[PDB]
Amino acid sequence: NLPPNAPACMERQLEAARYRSDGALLLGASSLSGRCWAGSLWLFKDPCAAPNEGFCSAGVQTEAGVADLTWVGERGILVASDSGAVELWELDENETLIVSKFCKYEHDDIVSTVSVLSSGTQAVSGSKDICIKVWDLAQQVVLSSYRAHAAQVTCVAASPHKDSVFLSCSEDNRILLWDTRCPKPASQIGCSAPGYLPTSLAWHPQQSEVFVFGDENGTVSLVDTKSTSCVLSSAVHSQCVTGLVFSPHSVPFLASLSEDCSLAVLDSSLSELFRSQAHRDFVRDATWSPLNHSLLTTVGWDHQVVHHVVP
Amino acid sequence: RVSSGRDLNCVPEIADTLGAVAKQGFDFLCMPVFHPRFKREFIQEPAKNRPGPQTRSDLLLSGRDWNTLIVGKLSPWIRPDSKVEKIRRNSEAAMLQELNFGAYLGLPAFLLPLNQEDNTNLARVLTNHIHTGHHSSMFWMRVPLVAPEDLRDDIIENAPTTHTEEYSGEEKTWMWWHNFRTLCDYSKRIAVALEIGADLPSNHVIDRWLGEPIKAAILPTSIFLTNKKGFPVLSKMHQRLIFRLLKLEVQFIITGTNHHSEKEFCSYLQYLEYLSQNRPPPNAYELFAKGYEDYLQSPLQPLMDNLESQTYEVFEKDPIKYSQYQQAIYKCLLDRVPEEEKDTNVQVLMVLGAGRGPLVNASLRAAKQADRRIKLYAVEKNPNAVVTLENWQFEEWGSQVTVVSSDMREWVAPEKADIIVSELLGSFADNELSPECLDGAQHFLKDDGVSIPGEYTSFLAPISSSKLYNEVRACREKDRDPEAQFEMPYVVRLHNFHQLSAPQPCFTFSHPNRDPMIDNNRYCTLEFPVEVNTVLHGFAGYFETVLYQDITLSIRPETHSPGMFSWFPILFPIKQPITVREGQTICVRFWRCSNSKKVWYEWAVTAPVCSAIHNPTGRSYTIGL
Ligand SMILES: C[S@@+](CC[C@H](N)C(=O)[O-])C[C@H]1O[C@@H](n2cnc3c(N)ncnc32)[C@H](O)[C@@H]1O
Ligand SMILES: [Cl-]
Ligand SMILES: [Cl-]
């Protein structure tokens, strides 16, 4: 059976996979080819059932594609749309419907990245229009609009526990550390040479002044914001690092997405522990199960919702 | 009115989207031909063998719609000049794939960005696609007036914006375009899509785009100010630019989402239409010049050739020219014969090169106005024009006018003349060979006789026009020098161009010529102070003439006779464009040469760099004697 609103089919290009604290699975998908170029939002109470449409808890269709996604608490879904809109979708009282809370067209091009800030009341979006916008999820408005970069914004990442702090990176080769408290909020951090363009950012879940960043040449780098000169790095992928996600573990494992169609799991020294060639297309997202911390899920463009067992 | 287009980087349903933009008032749509986020792999497996379809079907629109309403957009991930080899190769294959899909669709134009300094591989791939077939498709290079790096918010504590003046650095996006189009060998298929930002740069940066092939202007919604009624409007400085662009007849493009939520997407276009309608109207000259703008024409040779009938007709419909000739004769008649002699003294008036008879009639209107007696002779070499003259003299003029079907240089006059009146002048004054014509005729002018016109002077000004340079470039013909087109003058309504320095006199001729050794050959050196960074493509020529005393004619823009459309500027091109830096002097050399058979010009640029001497020995161009 398909929920009362859910479409008969889910678009081939799976962009996002987000495990809720209870264990439910959030799916973002787009139609990146064919007659219609739209998107859809899916909820799977059984993660082993995905990507099967007729076996989901809830489902809805957005007007355009889903470039990025994030959980906004337990019933909130924040969407980075191709329309240039940032969308907030509220999950039903029964959690059987996904209803549009707000659709605001503030960006002048595709919104490619979204990150919810520590409070869960504010969020930051990064667009192709080169701007970065700070949002009020309750008031449905943009508090601040920042044009700090020179090229498109690839990734925006809120700090785990600070509402004022967030990371951003762009095709202008800049990794910006933000702090809404300073009059000049951004600070251009980065190592000696410019090198290859930054593509992905992952804040450390325990060390609040540490983060990792993946480039366009498949390199993964470990960075201490204080020492401000990239000490540790490894050539993990043969193509652009699409995403970086840390495990919920006390000493977290680092999962690494790529366009080389592979997944990799790394330790503190960025050494390879696991590798999966499960995907036949681009690896788009990764979520560790809040229920089983050794379980890691992945979504790709090959419409595969793979489940991995991490040693 | 305005030809407008909507720019979108998101099209979920092509049929719906097009209908909405058409309902909004847009004449065309700029949209992706593949999905913007759909990165493709062409080398590495498994991503290489990705199942199709690679994009939406051509069946979704009619051929007519594809040909006239859709402007394709290159995918933003396609980066042919990336520092990463794999990305360079994938972006190459993807660029070829995308451009070929647009040609397969018969798209009227396709958009490609110039958003960084190095676009060498982007250019190579486009140039290679241009030479793969023979199509009429246009490539619009999306360039901003101001690079995004140079307009970024000053919010990076440890990387502040440079608050100092950087003249050449502020012009950087022009250099991006210049390099890209030089690499692509000035393809007529490569044009500019100029992206206008919220804050306009210094005028020199804007003026840097004068003479460039701007086919489209991109106006983001962000740049629109909001009026007291809540409607989107523009700053007076932005309005200034729009008005400059409307004369270039560019296609306006609206990009970005609607920030004026209370109103619809038709309001942005409504303001452009409002500005378009309110601009000053086209004057007598501007209305005539319409259609002749940057159209290269051959200069007329009324001496060597016999002008067509509809050609004299065109010349005759210039009112200011003949009003001025009338006045100059009127003034001469009173100065030559006093009121006490107004019935005993009859003036021998000779129209040398009478055409169909406008100067003959003007001479008559002038002798009636001055209340003096005149004896007219109408000398004309064109026998076809002489048919009109003889039918006029029999039907109207009478015995008063003696039509002479001859060349003034050969005609043996029965008596000398008091006044010789002629209109043997071209856009460069002496380019129709008036010095030689009147030199062989002045023997039958009284020792104290007046020549109307008494004097004429040619002027030159250095110009920049990559548009007109490419136009001259396209004038290659078979069975001649492959570069002969650059060694000849053109008559043209110079429109999309930049005058780099104030006109300066070149050649002057006075009639009658008192010199015992009459030499119409010349050599002139001019030094033109240039205060902009630019590229020289040639020299505009104009002229000034003294008919009699204060009665004059001019095509020099400074002193242009109001409403006179008989002459358009001449253009002397140069084979290779020359880079001129701000503060440099352009030194040009001009010669007027001749033998017994023909007259021609030769020219060379000697500063800031040398050119070859153009038209040596009149090998590419001569004016027949
Ligand atoms: C009609 S005016 C041309 C003025 C015109 N508006 C222009 O743009 O130059 C030139 C006339 O003088 C005549 N003409 C030129 N050379 C001549 C010559 N040597 N003897 C007699 N008539 C001559 C031509 O045949 C022509 O009719
Ligand atoms: Cl651009
Ligand atoms: Cl301009």
Side-chain angles (χ1 to χ4, degrees):
Chain A
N1 188 62
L2 279 141
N5 189 30
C9 189
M10 164 170 75
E11 295 93 338
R12 172 94 176 174
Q13 284 76 38
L14 303 173
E15 208 58 53
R18 297 298 151 96
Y19 269 139
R20 194 166 66 171
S21 55
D22 76 327
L25 187 75
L26 186 58
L27 282 182
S30 310
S31 183
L32 296 194
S33 201
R35 183 197 287 262
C36 188
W37 289 349
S40 60
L41 298 153
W42 301 93
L43 182 67
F44 275 93
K45 266 151 181 169
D46 180 7
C48 272
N52 206 316
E53 302 84 41
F55 289 86
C56 79
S57 328
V60 83
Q61 242 178 348
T62 38
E63 51 170 5
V66 174
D68 196 27
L69 214 53
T70 203
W71 267 123
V72 175
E74 294 293 288
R75 269 181 172 90
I77 301 145
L78 204 62
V79 198
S81 179
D82 287 324
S83 64
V86 163
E87 281 186 280
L88 181 66
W89 287 76
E90 212 130 293
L91 190 56
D92 202 27
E93 300 232 67
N94 316 89
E95 297 195 344
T96 61
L97 286 135
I98 300 160
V99 62
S100 178
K101 195 79 179 179
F102 77 77
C103 184
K104 300 282 176 183
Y105 310 96
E106 276 292 304
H107 281 299
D108 272 7
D109 210 320
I110 296 158
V111 189
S112 57
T113 178
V114 274
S115 211
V116 75
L117 297 155
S118 55
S119 68
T121 73
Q122 290 179 322
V124 87
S125 56
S127 175
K128 286 195 185 285
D129 83 340
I130 304 149
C131 298
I132 288 166
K133 290 172 187 267
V134 188
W135 295 82
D136 194 298
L137 306 167
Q139 276 174 258
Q140 300 184 356
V141 291
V142 177
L143 303 163
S144 310
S145 199
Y146 305 120
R147 193 181 285 280
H149 289 277
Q152 57 154 277
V153 202
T154 320
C155 189
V156 301
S159 60
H161 312 300
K162 289 157 164 184
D163 275 316
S164 294
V165 185
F166 64 90
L167 274 167
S168 85
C169 68
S170 166
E171 266 165 31
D172 69 352
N173 218 356
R174 284 182 179 115
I175 288 171
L176 298 184
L177 189 102
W178 297 79
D179 203 315
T180 69
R181 299 172 294 201
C182 313
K184 278 181 160 207
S187 155
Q188 203 187 309
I189 39 152
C191 6
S192 310
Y196 300 108
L197 300 170
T199 61
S200 56
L201 311 154
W203 275 113
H204 193 279
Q206 325 292 24
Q207 306 151 247
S208 228
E209 307 303 308
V210 164
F211 72 98
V212 295
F213 84 91
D215 67 8
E216 55 173 356
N217 202 41
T219 299
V220 181
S221 285
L222 168 64
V223 173
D224 199 306
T225 60
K226 302 289 166 181
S227 304
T228 188
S229 203
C230 324
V231 286
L232 204 57
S233 81
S234 213
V236 173
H237 298 299
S238 57
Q239 282 195 67
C240 162
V241 180
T242 312
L244 289 162
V245 165
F246 286 105
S247 74
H249 292 242
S250 317
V251 48
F253 297 97
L254 182 70
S256 191
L257 290 52
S258 187
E259 286 174 1
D260 81 340
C261 306
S262 79
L263 167 83
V265 179
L266 322 148
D267 58 22
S268 67
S269 62
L270 295 167
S271 291
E272 206 195 302
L273 306 158
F274 183 63
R275 189 165 287 278
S276 187
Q277 247 74 35
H279 285 280
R280 297 167 314 262
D281 220 351
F282 295 166
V283 184
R284 315 306 299 161
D285 219 341
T287 15
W288 304 84
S289 195
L291 281 37
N292 193 348
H293 286 181
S294 49
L295 176 74
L296 172 59
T297 302
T298 49
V299 299
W301 279 1
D302 58 355
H303 214 67
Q304 279 201 107
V305 174
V306 187
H307 299 289
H308 311 250
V309 281
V310 195
Chain B
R1 62 168 210 272
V2 176
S3 180
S4 57
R6 178 77 180 105
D7 179 45
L8 295 166
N9 214 28
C10 174
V11 172
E13 209 76 66
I14 184 147
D16 291 318
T17 297
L18 200 60
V21 313
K23 196 97 190 86
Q24 289 163 351
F26 301 108
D27 298 313
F28 68 95
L29 169 64
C30 311
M31 50 154 274
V33 300
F34 283 75
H35 191 274
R37 279 197 287 115
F38 201 54
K39 245 148 158 156
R40 264 102 62 199
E41 178 62 31
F42 299 85
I43 307 106
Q44 249 186 309
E45 281 182 352
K48 186 196 177 294
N49 317 124
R50 165 136 107 243
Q54 292 314 296
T55 187
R56 62 165 51 109
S57 186
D58 57 315
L59 285 178
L60 300 176
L61 283 179
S62 75
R64 187 106 230 94
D65 295 342
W66 289 123
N67 286 353
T68 64
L69 313 170
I70 301 297
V71 168
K73 283 176 67 169
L74 183 94
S75 281
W77 61 266
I78 296 167
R79 296 277 70 204
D81 295 277
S82 174
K83 305 284 271 159
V84 176
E85 188 174 307
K86 283 160 169 262
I87 299 169
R88 240 138 55 198
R89 296 195 182 269
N90 272 290
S91 299
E92 283 168 34
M95 191 179 157
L96 292 166
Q97 175 192 72
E98 286 211 347
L99 288 161
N100 290 333
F101 200 68
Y104 170 76
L105 284 174
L107 303 187
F110 199 101
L111 274 159
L112 287 100
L114 289 184
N115 52 30
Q116 52 171 67
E117 191 184 344
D118 188 7
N119 299 294
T120 311
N121 204 29
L122 178 91
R124 198 264 305 179
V125 182
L126 183 63
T127 305
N128 291 17
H129 163 75
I130 286 185
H131 294 97
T132 304
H134 223 271
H135 307 95
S136 291
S137 221
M138 288 294 311
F139 305 97
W140 290 349
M141 306 317 291
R142 198 169 173 151
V143 232
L145 274 179
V146 183
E149 181 59 54
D150 299 331
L151 49 84
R152 67 174 181 85
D153 285 340
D154 195 14
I155 52 168
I156 311 166
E157 156 266 337
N158 62 339
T161 56
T162 84
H163 318 280
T164 51
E165 138 111 289
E166 286 178 3
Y167 198 89
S168 293
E170 279 166 32
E171 299 174 342
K172 69 164 56 58
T173 63
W174 181 87
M175 196 51 75
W176 293 358
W177 156 255
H178 185 68
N179 290 339
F180 181 85
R181 60 91 175 279
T182 293
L183 284 171
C184 294
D185 194 21
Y186 290 76
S187 173
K188 54 169 199 204
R189 286 179 72 183
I190 303 165
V192 180
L194 190 73
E195 202 154 350
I196 289 109
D199 296 307
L200 289 192
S202 305
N203 277 303
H204 69 94
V205 185
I206 287 160
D207 290 10
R208 205 69 234 262
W209 296 92
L210 284 162
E212 301 291 352
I214 307 155
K215 274 299 146 200
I218 295 161
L219 321 165
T221 46
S222 343
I223 80 174
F224 279 84
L225 299 172
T226 332
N227 76 346
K228 291 280 127 95
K229 300 249 256 289
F231 290 97
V233 284
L234 287 164
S235 96
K236 282 297 252 182
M237 284 309 106
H238 278 74
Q239 281 174 69
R240 252 191 72 183
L241 190 52
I242 303 303
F243 289 133
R244 262 161 74 105
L245 286 157
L246 283 162
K247 300 266 105 164
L248 276 197
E249 294 177 62
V250 302
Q251 284 187 296
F252 289 91
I253 298 170
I254 310 287
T255 189
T257 54
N258 206 308
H259 297 111
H260 300 72
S261 202
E262 272 186 58
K263 325 283 185 259
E264 242 224 62
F265 269 109
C266 43
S267 58
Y268 291 109
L269 150 74
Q270 264 175 67
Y271 188 64
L272 284 167
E273 278 286 339
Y274 156 72
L275 291 174
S276 179
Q277 267 117 65
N278 281 57
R279 71 162 181 267
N283 43 70
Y285 194 98
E286 277 172 40
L287 212 65
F288 174 89
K290 279 303 276 169
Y292 301 104
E293 291 129 306
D294 296 324
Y295 185 92
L296 303 173
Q297 286 166 282
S298 291
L300 298 171
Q301 297 197 203
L303 178 63
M304 175 187 79
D305 309 311
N306 279 333
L307 293 174
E308 279 140 44
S309 163
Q310 275 170 59
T311 291
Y312 290 107
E313 184 180 70
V314 165
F315 297 161
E316 288 151 7
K317 91 141 174 194
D318 195 307
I320 321 296
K321 186 185 170 184
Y322 298 103
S323 292
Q324 284 290 87
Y325 263 93
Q326 198 188 312
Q327 196 69 36
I329 292 156
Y330 168 77
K331 261 229 188 181
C332 194
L333 289 171
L334 299 173
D335 296 20
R336 278 193 83 91
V337 292
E339 203 103 301
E340 41 266 25
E341 295 177 40
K342 82 159 213 75
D343 302 302
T344 192
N345 197 313
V346 52
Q347 289 281 99
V348 187
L349 234 125
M350 291 172 185
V351 184
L352 302 176
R356 283 154 115 223
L359 294 192
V360 171
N361 281 332
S363 294
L364 296 154
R365 289 193 310 284
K368 273 266 190 179
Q369 199 200 348
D371 208 314
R372 301 294 204 273
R373 294 235 286 101
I374 63 152
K375 192 185 179 180
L376 270 163
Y377 282 72
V379 189
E380 179 51 65
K381 63 110 204 173
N382 184 348
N384 304 281
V386 170
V387 166
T388 326
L389 290 177
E390 274 167 348
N391 262 245
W392 251 171
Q393 102 85 249
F394 177 84
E395 284 181 51
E396 308 292 312
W397 300 332
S399 54
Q400 192 169 28
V401 184
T402 293
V403 185
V404 172
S405 203
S406 188
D407 189 321
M408 68 182 87
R409 291 132 91 213
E410 280 294 87
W411 181 50
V412 178
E415 51 174 338
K416 283 181 188 182
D418 278 294
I419 314 151
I420 49 174
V421 175
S422 62
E423 56 176 348
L424 309 158
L425 292 175
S427 285
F428 207 44
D430 61 87
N431 58 300
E432 298 194 349
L433 277 29
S434 184
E436 293 78 14
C437 284
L438 305 178
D439 275 6
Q442 67 175 9
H443 66 99
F444 58 80
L445 178 81
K446 278 167 194 199
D447 288 35
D448 63 296
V450 171
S451 170
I452 299 173
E455 210 198 55
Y456 40 87
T457 299
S458 65
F459 287 83
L460 280 162
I463 68 131
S464 181
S465 189
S466 298
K467 164 85 206 125
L468 281 155
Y469 169 78
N470 226 7
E471 224 111 69
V472 176
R473 224 175 64 118
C475 283
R476 204 161 111 244
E477 287 168 21
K478 43 212 161 228
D479 311 343
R480 84 170 178 186
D481 200 310
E483 287 186 310
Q485 60 278 11
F486 294 110
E487 298 186 306
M488 54 181 68
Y490 297 87
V491 167
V492 40
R493 222 280 63 74
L494 307 158
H495 189 60
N496 185 18
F497 83 115
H498 190 190
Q499 190 159 103
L500 310 175
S501 201
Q504 286 193 39
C506 187
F507 305 139
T508 300
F509 292 89
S510 286
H511 296 297
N513 182 258
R514 358 241 69 255
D515 262 308
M517 284 78 74
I518 312 157
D519 198 342
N520 295 311
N521 291 335
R522 303 282 209 265
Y523 172 36
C524 178
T525 302
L526 302 166
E527 290 191 63
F528 290 111
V530 167
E531 306 307 330
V532 292
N533 289 316
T534 191
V535 190
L536 168 82
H537 297 95
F539 294 80
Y542 313 95
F543 81 91
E544 273 185 346
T545 192
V546 170
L547 301 173
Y548 190 66
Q549 283 163 14
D550 63 316
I551 306 108
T552 60
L553 302 160
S554 186
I555 75 157
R556 183 169 163 209
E558 297 97 272
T559 66
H560 204 274
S561 301
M564 196 181 64
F565 37 81
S566 262
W567 300 263
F568 279 155
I570 209 151
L571 165 77
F572 288 92
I574 58 162
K575 282 158 163 238
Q576 295 298 319
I578 297 169
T579 295
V580 187
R581 286 219 284 178
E582 163 212 40
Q584 294 191 309
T585 304
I586 293 168
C587 174
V588 76
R589 316 267 176 161
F590 251 82
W591 293 261
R592 196 188 183 264
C593 318
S594 67
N595 58 25
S596 43
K597 292 167 163 191
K598 45 226 169 76
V599 176
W600 64 94
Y601 299 101
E602 304 184 11
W603 60 101
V605 167
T606 54
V609 303
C610 262
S611 65
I613 289 157
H614 287 63
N615 197 32
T617 321
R619 60 152 179 222
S620 300
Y621 183 89
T622 58
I623 319 140
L625 264 177

